[PDB]
Amino acid sequence: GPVIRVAGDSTAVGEGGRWMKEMVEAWGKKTGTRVEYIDSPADTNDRLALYQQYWAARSPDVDVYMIDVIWPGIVAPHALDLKPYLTEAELKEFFPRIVQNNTIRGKLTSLPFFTDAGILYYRKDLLEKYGYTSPPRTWNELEQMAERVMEGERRAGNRDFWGFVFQGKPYEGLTCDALEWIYSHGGGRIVEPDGTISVNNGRAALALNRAHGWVGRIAPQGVTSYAEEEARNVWQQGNSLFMRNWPYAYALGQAEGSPIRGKFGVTVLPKASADAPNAATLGGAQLMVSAYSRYPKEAVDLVKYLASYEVQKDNAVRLSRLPTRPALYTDRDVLARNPWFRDLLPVFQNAVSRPSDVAGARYNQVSEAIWTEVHSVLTGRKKGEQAVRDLEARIRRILRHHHH
Ligand SMILES: OC[C@H]1O[C@H](O)[C@H](O)[C@@H](O)[C@@H]1O
């Protein structure tokens, strides 16, 4: 019988790869279908380049791909339209915003699998130890808390201790972190939904200069090479007061044998001032059937199973990853395990998107521009003012003659 082959998630990032293979194998056992899991590199932009090799070749060697929320406009030609396979009632069980994101020129490229939003992780034990009752609401507060707690923990002999870790490596995760810095300073969305390239403004410049000012001071010098896992590893070992990361790090930090089990909470990221917007970059994964799959029916069945209530529930309970089904946010077992899913649901719903809708199939080029110009500020090569001017110019060239 057919062998259904899946590429999605990575064994290099938390438990995602391992869990994904387990789910695919469970489907295979349930249906009596042979399955194979193909592993992927950690970083989304590397995954995209890998999958593009299969797509360019029209390869039948992968039937199902896990695709990033930023990808439908790029990958649509390589996706089987799922719309004829789903009833309107079935589709309404997912958040409509994500179904819409995944629909490109009428083609439902992919089913919503898990969502994602950037959040602030904080050491509650250390806040209490140093006289703070709440996590920081403004970036200035975050800096002040980080300096005071670092001073004390260093003095007490933890030479590995930092105030803040985040994703500063030149890759897609930095575009996510930088959108949050820029938007939370009232500096806009980099490229607005209407197409306006707005990033050349003083608030965006200030956001980038602020981030530079962390490097080597409250954040390690090496933070300019950190992706999700590098940040998480410093944090999880007990060596950072604060971390910006995604939901998945919560379950990992709570696992038996984690140095920080029971010592942390999560909240919305800080912002420049009370009247700035909260920023949480929208992330997450969707499930695509390859246009080149020889087994569309079987692959659709697998995608439906993976996106089902009980599989998403398992993802939420065991891996603290966010459902794309609103009904799961009222599920007693989901909430007992992750009470913060309720507290932060409005943050998740109000997550700010990267400019993938407006950039469409040129999104990856736009994002590479963003992360390289932002990186040049983090490394000290450029100031924020020059970097946003140069970024404006780069994005104008990329998007010239593109309309949405
Ligand atoms: O590193 C950046 C990536 O981080 C997470 O995987 C998000 O789910 C994804 O949307 C984002 O592109």
Shortest-distance atom of ligand 1 to CA 281: 10
Neighbour-count burial of 335, counting CB atoms closer than 10 A to its CB (0-12 exposed, 13-18 middle, 19+ buried): middle
Give the largest CA-CA distance in the chain.
65
Domain count, the chain: 2
Neighbours of 339 (CB within 10 A): 10
Domain end residue (candidates: 306, 324, 350): 350
Strand-pair category, 103-104 with 107-108: antiparallel
- Treating both helix axes as pointing N-terminal to C-terminal, what angle do 202-214 and 363-378 enclose, rounded to 10 degrees? 60
Domain end residue (candidates: 335, 350, 365): 350
Give the distance (Å) from ligand 1 centre to CA of residue 280: 12
Angle at 332 between CA 326 and CA 336, to 5 degrees: 110
DSSP 328: G
Nearest CA to ligand 1 atom 7: 283
Shortest-distance atom of ligand 1 to CA 43: 1
Residue 161 is part of which domain span? 117-282+351-404
* Residue among 51, 116, 354, 363 to mutate when testing ligand 1 (max atoms within 8 A of CB): 116
Are residues 105 and 134 both part of a single domain? no
Are residues 140 and 30 both part of a single domain? no
Are residues 103 and 7 both part of a single domain? yes
Give the whole-angstrom CA distance, residue 403 versus residue 218. Answer: 42
Q: Is 94 left (phi over 0), alpha (psi -120 to 50) or beta?
A: beta
Whether the Cβ atoms of residue 3 and residue 36 lie closer than 8 Å to each other: yes
Are residues 193 and 309 both part of a single domain? no
For residues 135-157, one letter each, b for 16 or more C-beta atoms within 10 angstroms of the residue's C-beta and e for the rest, the string is: bbbebeebbebbeebbeebeeee
Neighbours of 100 (CB within 10 A): 11
Structure tokens at 32: 């009596």
Are residues 69 and 157 both part of a single domain? no
In the block, tokens 């290099």 appear at: 12
Give the whole-angstrom CA distance, residue 266 versus residue 247. Answer: 9
Give the distance (Å) from ligand 1 centre to CA of residue 112: 14
Neighbour-count burial of 275, counting CB atoms closer than 10 A to its CB (0-12 exposed, 13-18 middle, 19+ buried): exposed
Give the whole-angstrom CA distance, residue 327 versus residue 253. Answer: 26
Nearest CA to ligand 1 atom 9: 283
Are residues 167 and 182 both part of a single domain? yes
Are residues 193 and 253 both part of a single domain? yes
In the block, tokens 């439908």 appear at: 72
- In DSSP terms, 374 is beta-bridged to none
Are residues 17 and 92 both part of a single domain? yes
Shortest-distance atom of ligand 1 to CA 116: 8
Neighbour-count burial of 257, counting CB atoms closer than 10 A to its CB (0-12 exposed, 13-18 middle, 19+ buried): exposed
Domain end residue (candidates: 350, 366, 384): 350
- Backbone φ and ψ for 389, nearest 5 degrees, come out as -65, -45
Task: List ligand 1's pocket residues with C-beta within 6 A.
Answer: 44, 68-70, 116, 172-173, 176, 228, 246, 283-284
Nearest CA to ligand 1 atom 2: 173
Smallest Cα–Cα separation from 113: which of 304, 317, 297? Answer: 304
Are residues 183 and 247 both part of a single domain? yes
Resolution in A: 1.8
Task: Please report which helix (H) or strand (E) contains residue 288, including its range.
Answer: strand 282-289
DSSP 217: T
Please state the three-class secondary structure of 162-202 as a single string. Answer: EEEECCCCCCHHHHHHHHHHHHHCCCCCCECCCCCECCCCH
In the block, tokens 């980099």 appear at: 190
In the block, tokens 């056992």 appear at: 29
Whether the Cβ atoms of residue 6 and residue 62 lie closer than 8 Å to each other: yes
Q: What is the dihedral of CA 89, 107, 20, 7, to 10 degrees?
A: 160
Are residues 58 and 197 both part of a single domain? no
* Residue among 246, 320, 367, 368 to mutate when testing ligand 1 (max atoms within 8 A of CB): 246
- Backbone φ and ψ for 103, nearest 5 degrees, come out as -105, 120
